[PDB]
Design a protein around this ligand. Structure first.
Ligand SMILES: CC(C)N1CCc2nc(C(=O)Nc3cc(C(=O)O)ccc3CCC(=O)Nc3ccc(Cl)cc3)sc2C1
Ligand SMILES: [Ca+2]
Ligand SMILES: [Ca+2]
Lengths: 233, 54
């Protein structure tokens, strides 16, 4: 995350972190329920073996609430392609159920029509993660969150060197130096509505991080609500 | 002119749907619609969408 703030105690309890065999984070995820993690399809190519870590806010310090979970099943969208990053969504089923507690809790899955009419028409969403603090920087050892404006679809298409499919939306800032970045991919984009947080996107891609005239590109979760429901069986 | 779910979310806490000419409210999984047919009540501990305080 470029710019934005620390997640303070309890503020981003639906954050998951995909960690490699060396215990380094490489992608984010969202807790959907005791058993299921939402993430990006393209993250699954970023490591042979990985686990999921929840309840972590400071990677350099044991705060007590941390839990590592093993992945039992990887459910990747079959229509995902590296060529376009279209259908950039995947669900993970964990071997053992997540025990909800302080800093560990699911985000709500919305209903399609209402999310699109009511959530995605709000001023801003919230993206979070342990990713890079700037384009050329290193990964944050602190979990961060950032408020990102929904970006008009046609402005985004015009701003982009690559196709923006129906399964993507744009969020962030034109010139202001705030954005998601490398390592935040797969992570939560949520929208607050009356003190309740709904999953509205998955951190997908961008041309650098916080580059002028470029936005953050997110998987449009609302297009994948029947898919996610199916995947959670 | 804003009507039904377009007028302050139909007074619903969460989901709002328009049926006939009438607002129907509902709730995320793990919540129950209150008696007033509008508010959403957590059924148990750590309901989705809520930041944690304990
Ligand atoms: C298949 C198409 C759609 N692509 C998907 C992957 C992709 N990655 C692209 C890219 O520009 N990546 C890149 C280049 C450099 C650098 O060279 O300095 C440094 C870091 C990166 C990764 C930055 C990144 O994750 N950005 C980011 C990711 C998600 C969001 Cl919501 C906002 C920003 S451009 C692009 C286009
Ligand atoms: Ca820690
Ligand atoms: Ca920008």
């Amino acid at each position: 995350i470029v710019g934005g703030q620390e997640c303070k105690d309890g503020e981003c309890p639906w954050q998951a972190l995909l960690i490699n065999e060396e215990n380094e984070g490489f992608c984010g995820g969202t807790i959907l329920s005791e058993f299921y993690i939402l993430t990006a399809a393209h993250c699954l190519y970023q490591a042979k073996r990985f686990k999921v870590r929840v309840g972590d806010r400071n990677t350099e310090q044991e705060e007590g609430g941390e839990a590592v979970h093993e992945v039992e099943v990887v459910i990747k969208h079959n229509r995902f392609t590296k060529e376009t990053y279209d259908f950039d969504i995947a669900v993970l089923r964990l071997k053992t159920p997540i025990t909800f507690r302080m800093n560990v809790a699911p985000a709500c899955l919305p209903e399609r029509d209402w999310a699109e009419s009511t959530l995605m028409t709000q001023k801003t969403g919230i993206v979070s993660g342990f990713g890079r603090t700037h384009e050329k920087g290193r990964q944050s050892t602190r979990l961060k969150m950032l408020e990102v404006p929904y970006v008009d679809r046609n402005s985004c298409k015009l701003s982009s060197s690559f196709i923006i499919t129906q399964n993507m939306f744009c969020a962030g800032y034109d010139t202001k130096q705030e954005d998601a970045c490398q390592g935040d991919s797969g992570g939560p984009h949520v929208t607050r509505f009356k003190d309740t947080y709904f999953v509205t996107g998955i951190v997908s891609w961008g041309e650098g991080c916080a580059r002028k005239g470029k936005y953050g590109i997110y998987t449009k979760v609302t297009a994948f609500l029947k898919w996610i429901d199916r995947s959670m069986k | 002119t804003r009507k039904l779910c377009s007028l302050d979310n139909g007074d619903c806490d969460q989901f709002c749907h328009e049926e006939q000419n009438s607002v129907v409210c509902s709730c995320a999984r793990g919540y129950t619609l209150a008696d007033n047919g509008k508010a959403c009540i957590p059924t148990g501990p750590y309901p989705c969408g809520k930041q944690t305080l304990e």
